[PDB]
């Protein structure tokens, strides 16, 4: 299948409680491979070292610079706490070739600036992000980001995938069952379960007489089990007696074929 390497970085100011906390977490697909936390007694955690640690430390200082500049760009007081988030990295296909790169930011939960798919130009959300844009154009930042995303990112992802092929390239199918719970004399809940799967991407739906029931299905967010795998369920309320009109459909990369399940 296709794979991604992505960093999810958070920097959070906290006036009166020290310098902003920086945390960076790196993933291959849905597997964390590195963490750096500026508040850690022991910075970096892991499931040359030197050079990577230095980049995380410098990134801490860079995100603090960013937070200071952003406060000014929005005329904000020094009293409040603010959040800067970053996503960066690369997606490859089954052959290892670059599908696309990513380098983007959000401020206080709102998209701020992103490197376009061309890896050459920027999209700025507002007049503040236009300042960042002009700054980055003047310094030819996109070129540096492009070089990382097309070179180092893709090369490291390919090496990690190969070295970790027994886990990172293994899709574990869901274990599935349907449960049944009366809610009244007239109606019952059917709940379709998917347990033990990896990666997290899954589709779980109910149909009635072969028609999708999007509006009447309760679908919980996919959730981690803590052993690398994920869980999800989907529930529908059905009239008593009509249970066999309902089918649960399951698609996942680890299945040899899609599943159609019914109560018992």
């Amino acid at each position: 299948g296709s794979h991604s390497m992505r960093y999810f970085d958070t920097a959070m100011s906290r006036p009166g409680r020290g310098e902003p906390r920086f945390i960076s977490v790196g993933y291959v697909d849905d597997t964390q491979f590195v963490r750096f936390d500026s508040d850690a007694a022991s910075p970096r955690e892991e499931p040359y070292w030197d050079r990577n640690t230095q980049i995380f430390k410098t990134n801490t200082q860079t995100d603090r610079c960013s937070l200071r500049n952003l406060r000014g760009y929005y005329n904000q007081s020094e009293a409040g706490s603010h959040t800067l988030q970053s996503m960066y990295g690369c997606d490859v296909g089954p052959d290892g070739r670059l599908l696309r790169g990513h380098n983007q930011y959000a401020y206080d939960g709102k998209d701020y600036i992103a490197l376009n798919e061309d890896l050459r130009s920027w999209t700025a959300a507002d007049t503040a992000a236009q300042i960042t844009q002009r700054k980055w154009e003047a310094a030819r930042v996109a070129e540096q980001d492009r070089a990382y995303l097309e070179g180092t990112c893709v090369e490291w992802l390919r090496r990690y995938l190969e070295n970790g092929k027994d886990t990172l390239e293994r899709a574990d199918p869901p274990k599935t069952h349907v449960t049944h719970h009366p809610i009244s004399d007239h109606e019952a809940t059917l709940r379709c379960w998917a347990l033990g799967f990896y990666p997290a991407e899954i589709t779980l739906t109910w149909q009635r007489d072969g028609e999708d029931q999007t509006q009447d299905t309760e679908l919980v967010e996919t959730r981690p089990a803590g052993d690398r795998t994920f869980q999800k369920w989907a529930a529908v309320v059905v009239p008593s007696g009509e249970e066999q009109r309902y089918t649960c459909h399951v698609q996942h990369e680890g299945l040899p074929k899609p599943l159609t399940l019914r109560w018992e």
């Binding site: 960093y7 970085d9 960076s24 790196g26 590195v34 040359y48 050079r51 990577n52 980049i55 995380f56 410098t58 990134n59 860079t62 995100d63 610079c65 960013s66 500049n69 952003l70 800067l84 970053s86 960066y88 990295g89 380098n103 930011y105 701020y112 600036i113 960042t132 700054k135 980055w136 310094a139 930042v141 540096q144 980001d145 990382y148 180092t152 990112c153 490291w156």
Partner: peptide, 10 residues
């Protein structure tokens, strides 16, 4: 060589 990306100040 490094696997972590260098960032730039906004």
């Amino acid at each position: 060589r490094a696997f972590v990306g260098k960032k730039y100040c906004l």
